[PDB]
Symmetry: C5
Subunit: 400 residues, 5 copies
């Protein structure tokens, strides 16, 4: 249109995009800064970066970009690309992208009275600390720090407006608790000019249904399965394979969880210590199995049963468990031969009678250690799982 | 040509690529927006990102870019590169590309009446929520949101033209149901103007043949083979070995299928339900095998058969399953030794006959659990697989 | 050079890089398009993306860029950079790259009479369909579709010339067969004017010396070793172990072959069919082994062999496979004691005879199933591998 | 303001951004260089690349950009963008980024007396030598070499200022020791002029809690479990299974650590030595188990035990380990028969005694090898771990 | 300063960066090309690309950039950024980078007499054929081809200087042998115009210590462990398990080697041949073990040993292997009963004698195959390992 042609010709006359558009040089320029969260793309525990989709929102007042609507009827807003008009050089301090500023440079909407609006979108790769002490029951606080790079207090001051989450799209993995900001200043040593900035802390809680169902219940189920070795009869000589096989499966599980995990040395992760507890449990199970197997295959002609073992395992450990202890000249020569055979059979029976005691002792030890291990595994898993804060309500909100 | 030289020189005179080319400044500018799908390149469920090849279609009527054909014979159209004429600032809202705009800027073809055509190509990475509840018998809807970034409804009013799929190249994995769009007018609280926008919802369906042949069926054969532990005779120890090795094969399968899919906590996936059910079936099979082995290797005098088991397993279950039960002074000394040997043999005979009942009971319970688990696996697999709403359609299309 | 400087100054007077350089505006401008293949960098079966290294060859005639050599002695050719002279806008229609035009903008060499040459190199990524129906004996045809984006057939007469392969560098995996090209005219829904394009089809054949050694031969070897169970005597305890470990190795092998290959549902790959057949073979091997184990440990005093089963196994197959079957008052008291002992021994001998007959039946069944499984796996492997077309030619070229 | 606009107009006048801003052309310009470490992001061992977040600091004195604040009251500082004033060309020599210069070009802040201050941020990837001889108890020294590219020592007098670590954010895995720097002068084959450069060395210590808990301790535990084969009675065939399965798990661990470790041939890693030692220990355990099993299943009436082995095993070693060694005509015909039976039984008893002595010898060998292997593995592990320098410092700082 | 500004203003008058800076247009311009190796970043065997840190080095003479120092006393050199002066267009012919020119454009230093220096750094990625026939004892030649893209003999004749390896930082895996170069001229069909270019060949030798300690030694050790199946007595039921688990471990080792190595089909790698040989050895080890097991569990009444086997496995090899072969009417009824019992025991004795003879034959076969396999494995290993060229050089330079 004719009027907007005239306006665009007139406005850029003697305009320098290198100057602050303030009527008075001494007075600072007021700039309002705010966010608009749209989505959380990914939270990388291993690399400790946070990727989000965010619309910035900056606004100020321009002294020179003013006109009277009466002289230019119909036109009431104008737009300018980058470089042609002055903009605040506000950029993220916590950036982790290769280019230090990931932000699409869009148009600047201008008032008929000098008020500019700037809403550039972009995908921001922050670098925030990822606490992993209570994984997978986590609450994370990642900070985004914005502010002018080469402008001070007398240059321009920054004011905070509350973050907008009206357009938030919920994420499958993380639950957004909130996003509160704060405006703070920082004085230097030379000069008493406040240097303001705005920081936003994004707080998220991990939803634990997936990690629970895929990590914890399988591991606890097969750890409970690992106690079946104490139920097998020792005569079926395939007890060791069970223990070693479940140990191998647990090792595979551990190395995968190490794969997902980062490599910080700040604290012992809950899942890692739980896996270590299961490691020790299965190892002690295998050791006890070897002990019982040694007891079962005892040589009858070897050493005698010690009195301590006899009085402990066969008496007290049986009372505790209420387990029952289930217990003519040639005529002389032929007589001697038959007597020899009978005596040999008697000796064989007496020798076999000894092995029964050892086998019963093996069964008793097996039952006792079964009970002890079954109690211990439950105690350990319950204590470790419930030791984490943010567990009861986490499970109540996820699994229910 | 001299005529096109003169025309190109004349058109750019006084032209301003900043002003919106309308004869009347008060009235808006109508812009027609459409789409042209070429192919779907990727659907990443783990990152929730859709990659497509798309040709944008825009069209508006410029005002100043007009000329008389008679004055410039031969010339019918002109072409302008980026930055030399006014273009709509149309952007994709939900984008996952690090650079927010992912369109290749090409020339604009302008007719002699002042009609501009803009057909920029590009590869678009938009983020859409990919439901995984009914995986792999899945149907997904992903939305693309387009619209001007900084032009209002009093200035630029979008219009819809139906999407073009004439050039579509079919995908191997995804079947395209269709891509219907819709035009809507959002209203601002300040002002009575509309804010037109156009959204395109791409609907696709996964083809269930690769997954069917590589994940579903192999698990069925492995689970079925896990029941071979029951037909096996307990005399040759292989039962626990069989059970555990099937278990680990299932674990590695579950690890694969877990690393394929994302960590969302919105619902339990169908494949997860199937694998968990197989987990439980194999574990219970191993437990039953342990019980059977305990029954088989029973000490002949370590106890007595309780009346409940003696009646049940030996008569009732044999009835149900139709299995038959498996069935001078120097001479008196010789007398008592020979009778002692005979008595020893008789005692051994009766003790050996005792264990036959225990072995038969083990066989009976083994057959019973075989039948029960054979029914259970079939029922569970059939129910879980047929629970999917479009299972019949998928099996009729992909397979038949 | 003064002459070079003066000519460069003169050639750019009133030159518009926006106009098509023709003497008469009505007739189109002829452009010859070719292509110089240099290297096939990579073929991505999983992503259906082909990466090649090519040099474009465009040539046309510029009417304004002419000069008389007699007045410019030394200079015979000139070079112009990007954006200073008119260039055709030719780009790939199939680019699977984040940027839709991956070419390095080099100079344009100009004749002394107005002929322009343009040879921009670059690495081109394109999306072409990949066939896995005959993996790894497949022949792939991929397409490269070039054309002007914004010039119709009335302004750009695109022509074609044969592709150049004189500098081709052979690849270590794919053997180049040829690269023809054909011109075509297409109508687009945008506009009522044909748009010519030039399509080059690259035909290449995969060499099968690496896959034949690392995916086929090991599978055959361990499938054959899976038949070693039928030789192993049942008196040992390592038959089920053999079978199930073979299954584990086979599953790992198939899983890796699955991860390398694309997830298409258009056909069942040859390697997939082979792996499924081998899975079935080993599974039935395990089932037969279970049956033989149950036969060999058959408990006597239970059910006698059926007449049909006996007359089959002990006679027909036994003769067929050339197998031979394994074949004072105290005196009265002493008398009936020794009578009891002798009768006990006689009954024991009868029981052992029945057991020996059962074990012979098991051996015969094992031998027969050995023969059947061996012949069946041989014929299935040969048939599956020889079903593919151009298999013998590939075998000859690669191995011999 | 008016003063700001006038000053910006005045400064730009007759300014060439190509000339070095010095009052005297023959005098070198002084530039102060400094660093500000913000965060160590990644230490890639395989690729030997260190990624850090760094702010560069540069400062010099421009001769032309000076003014009197009396004539320009409000304005005290001005800002200039890239490409409008002279800037140094300081760039990293060791950059490993695909684009050689990875820095964000910000404004340049200027005094009223011409003092320029330039603080460009950026994320720098540099190639530094990584030493893994003492992994995971290593201390690394990575250098960053900065310096002007095309400015010699007679024009740009580079100076170094101490690095700033006040804004350092501690990293979970790496511990910062110090960042000293020195300014050295070098000669290059290009030119006969010295080119000064500034090198900063980053010294980092690796926190070892993660690796100590995830790699060393589980390896220790399962290596110890591998010694249980010397407590299993030989009558249960489950010793080779134990040894070989632990060997398999060890091989898996070796594969994983080799995955983490880079391919280098400078010196053997400590963890590589540890895993090799564990390999040999477990292999020797398996060999000893094979020897013991061969001893146990001796066939009597065959090889008589040699006198040397007899005495060594059953006199000295057995006592040393406190092991106790275990241990009418018809009447004539019947006499002959009973004599034959008794003699056969006596021969069986003698064979049993020989078997018992062989089994006792096997047990003695087993116990002796158990003790030897235990002491050997303890000594080897403790020596290998303790050989690393500052291992005591590492454990004291991390664990305690 | 003053003279700097004056000279900079004077040097750009009427200066066209598009023209070749020569005094005579007909005569060509001499350009000297060179290189400066800094580091070999990576050698990718799979994608077959080479990454290096390189500073190019070009030098030529400019006719127009000349001045007399006495007129401008302070300035001796001037610097021009990209786009201000004429630069030769020299780029990598065989680059394998997504952008065809990975080169950082720095300043150009010009002397008082017109000499120009241009040393742009960069991280180049070139695709060079990588031979893998001799892995890991490998020597690779990679060629870098540089040349002009638009100029020829009458326009630009590239001379040569030897590549500079001063300041080259040794890599931990690849040892540099040399970087020879060679200039050459190529003529076109039309005209006798040379087209000189410079090519550099980088020759590097892989250091084999890491691969020897991670791939060769462990596989030899496990292969030797596989031979232990020939010392385990047949009574233990753990002979098949040993061989099978060795096969599994070696399969996963082959998997790793498959992942590291390229998928070429031009030769059979040495490591591939060695792994195939070891596979074959273990396979016949398992086959022989099965034969021995079926030989040892031979029923006494199932047949008789053939004469050939009886004479070759019991008299010839036994001596060769130095093994010794191990070795009133009621009274009549009582007599007949005891005669029956004695005859029964006699038949048992003959049976176990035949069984013992069969077991001796099995042991002899076992020892024979042990010796044969022990010789064969070492023969094949030595042959394959020493078959490679420069293997003595590799071991001498790495392990000493
Ligand atoms: C400016 O730079 C070039 C650098 O080469 C100088 O050329 C050298 O001049 C000396 C004088 O004898 C010769 O020995 C060298 O061989 C020349 N080098 C080359 C490549 O030709 C040139 O002299 C310098 N000019 C001034 C005024 O310093
Ligand atoms: C052939 N071109 C490429 C696709 C459409 C067509 C076109 C037509 C007009 C303006 N731009 C593109």
């Amino acid at each position: 249109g004719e009027f907007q042609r005239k306006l665009y010709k007139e406005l850029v006359k003697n305009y320098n995009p290198l100057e602050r558009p303030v009527a008075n040089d001494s007075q600072p320029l007021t700039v309002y800064f705010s966010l608009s969260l749209l989505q959380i793309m990914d939270v990388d525990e291993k690399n400790q970066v946070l990727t989000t989709n965010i619309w910035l929102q900056m606004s100020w007042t321009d002294h020179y970009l003013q006109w009277n609507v009466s002289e230019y009827p119909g036109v009431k807003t104008v737009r300018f690309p980058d470089g042609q008009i002055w903009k605040p050089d506000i950029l993220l301090y916590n950036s982790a992208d290769e280019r230090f500023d990931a932000t699409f440079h869009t148009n600047v909407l201008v008032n008929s009275s000098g008020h500019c609006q700037y809403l550039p979108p972009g995908i921001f790769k922050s670098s925030c600390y990822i606490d992993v002490r209570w994984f997978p029951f986590d609450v994370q606080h990642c900070k985004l720090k914005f502010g002018s790079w080469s402008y001070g207090g007398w240059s321009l001051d920054l004011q905070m407006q509350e973050a907008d989450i009206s357009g938030y799209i919920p994420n499958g993995e993380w639950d957004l608790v909130g996003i509160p900001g704060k405006r703070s200043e920082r004085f230097y040593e030379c000069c008493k000019e406040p240097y303001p900035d705005v920081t936003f802390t994004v707080t998220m809680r991990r939803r634990t249904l997936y990690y629970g169902l895929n990590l914890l219940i399988p591991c606890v189920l097969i750890s409970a399965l690992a106690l079946l070795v104490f139920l097998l009869p020792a005569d079926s000589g395939e007890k060791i394979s069970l223990g070693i096989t479940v140990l191998l499966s647990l090792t595979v599980f551990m190395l995968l969880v190490a794969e997902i995990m980062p490599a910080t040395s700040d604290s012992v992760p809950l899942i890692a210590q739980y896996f270590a507890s299961t490691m020790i449990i299965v190892g002690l199970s295998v050791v006890v199995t070897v002990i019982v197997l040694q007891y079962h295959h005892h040589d009858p002609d070897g050493g005698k049963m010690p009195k301590w073992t006899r009085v402990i395992l066969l008496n007290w450990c049986a009372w505790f468990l209420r387990m029952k202890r289930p217990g003519d000249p040639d005529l002389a020569k032929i007589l001697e031969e038959v007597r020899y055979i009978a005596n040999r059979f008697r000796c064989q029976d007496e020798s076999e009678a000894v092995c029964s005691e050892w086998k019963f002792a093996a069964c008793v030890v097996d039952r006792l250690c079964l009970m002890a291990f079954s109690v211990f595994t439950i105690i350990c898993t319950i204590g470790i799982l419930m030791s984490a804060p943010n567990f009861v309500e986490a499970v109540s909100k996820d699994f229910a």
